[PDB]
Symmetry: C4
Subunit: 191 residues, 4 copies
């Protein structure tokens, strides 16, 4: 029985091939555990208070008729479950469940071609060798979030190996084109 | 497509004209997305664990007949959504939704002239160049929160420019004079 | 209009008479805003991430018949509202609302003479002059929590002065002798 | 009346017999306060922001038919009550209540022999002598979580002594073999 973490804490991972492996180049939207999800991958420069946060940047007009040049809307990535405090040894695909509280609630494969936004990702977590306070950030514009895609796995096992050549790799999978909001609407009247 | 944040994290912002641009001189109360909101602006001395908190300081007599010289009441500014963890590159207008849980629940344009309070704002966030732990504070007395006002935008775009000459600038906009509490009461009997 | 905090953040407080003024010597239980409350006072060695936490230490037998020598039970002091992140310039009386989720739910003035417990208080908050990480702790045994008592105020105003000679001072006030649990039971059948 | 913590904060504990006493060698599952609970013990290398987090590592196939080599699922250990911020002077047995939100919801004494998983525990808390940022980790594979076991106590009292020779010691106690999920199902139809 090959364990991932030793009783004394040492991780049994083998990493195998510039900060190009910190964040995946694209993010995707697809189904996982019955939910449409915004996903992107996180690695390392290769977890002391390692926390992740995501914001949606976009222009929008409020119902009051006010135009907001660049408004920030939160993107729940675990803050409500502690899942945002990452145990970050091997690559992790961060998941944002699209629900009625999400800024992507009414985003559909069709609306994506019209919408213009920017998902900013911020990772903070004191370093391993100095415990120093560092922050890495990334961004995903509208054209960098792939609807109907899924990430290829990077972990396998006589070592627990990470294949970083597939870090940024995704592929298409049958996915409804509807937005979660349209889905709740359909099911309600297609029931 | 000019992006706000580069794939490697660098921000594409141009700041353009003493810590006078950290907090806006006044705060305002007006409608945003269907809700009466207490708002004030945040900038920088020009975000590692950049967090904001707001407290309402005021004297009050409890129902037990006890007079509290200076009582502190919390002012929700995102603690319940993670929105209080700021991504603070360009100016941000902090929003406090006035609801049944807010200390301003029954504050009306009329009561404002009678009430006496002090909103203290506290910003904490390790610095960029040393990652050091710093804290900036500000205050807004009753006469410094403008009912029926809205902040002028400061961002525009071939750069993403911040015009700090309008940082403290606000203007009047038609706003109901009622307190959120009176509003729920009216709607209930004006329905 | 004398303000508590200046626009630039400086506090306008005058402190006036060994770490004897960090925590009040006793804690009390009495009514505030219609709720029976456990209270104790916090000062300073005279707030960068200044947070407070309270635990109840006591022996107890679980319903499974297991005797727990020293069990720790949480004492909510604002963790669910952000109120536990203290803005700590002048003395503050920490409040623990006794409800169905509190370990003191069924504690009555009568049971107090029988019960044996220990409320441990832990304060953490990077220091002002170095921003260093410090922690101060205190304890209140059963005989150090005064039922039917209230703390004397310490703040007044041409300065905003703190009189630390009354820091530890409390006095008796008419208070129901019932536990919050008995109170909900009475009201239910005395309605 | 021997108190656990002095008024000035000093702890009145006597520790009595390599980092072998940081985490208990096994974890157990048994009943405490009417709930089936995953438990393990925490000690010290012998609490400034001392926080604990637990993750469940395992392979799983999503309903979409996707095989996840090593998926991480959160294990609630107090994040929703503040109980995860440990006051860590004497040994503490961390408790994870198995409910509908837990990854062990449907784990039974029978399924345990079939299941393969890994509970990773991560403890973070600035040190006492330097206030430095340290992290200790441990792991419990499926064969290291004992169903129907309970930990022996380690505390007693003319000192408040910790007997670390029983730190890792557990014993069997009558415990239902059903998973919490089967239990809710039984009670529903055995009512």
């Amino acid at each position: 029985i090959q364990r991932y973490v030793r009783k004394d804490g040492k991780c049994n991972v083998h990493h195998g091939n510039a900060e190009t492996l910190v964040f995946s180049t694209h993010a995707v939207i697809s189904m996982r555990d019955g939910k449409l999800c915004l996903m992107f991958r996180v690695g390392d420069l290769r977890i002391v208070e390692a926390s992740i946060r995501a914001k949606l940047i976009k222009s929008k007009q409020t119902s009051e008729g006010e135009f907001i040049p660049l408004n920030q809307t939160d993107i729940n990535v675990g803050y409500y479950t502690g899942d945002d405090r990452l145990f970050l040894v091997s690559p992790l695909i961060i998941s944002h469940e699209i629900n009625q509280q999400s800024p992507f609630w009414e985003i559909s494969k069709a609306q994506l071609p019209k919408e213009e936004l920017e998902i900013v990702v911020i990772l903070e977590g004191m370093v391993e060798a100095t415990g120093m306070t560092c922050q890495a950030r990334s961004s995903y514009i509208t054209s960098e979030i792939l609807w109907g895609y899924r990430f290829t796995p990077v972990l396998t096992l006589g070592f627990y190996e990470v294949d970083y050549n597939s870090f940024h790799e995704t592929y298409e999978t049958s996915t409804p084109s509807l937005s979660a909001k349209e889905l709740a609407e359909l099911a309600n009247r297609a029931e």
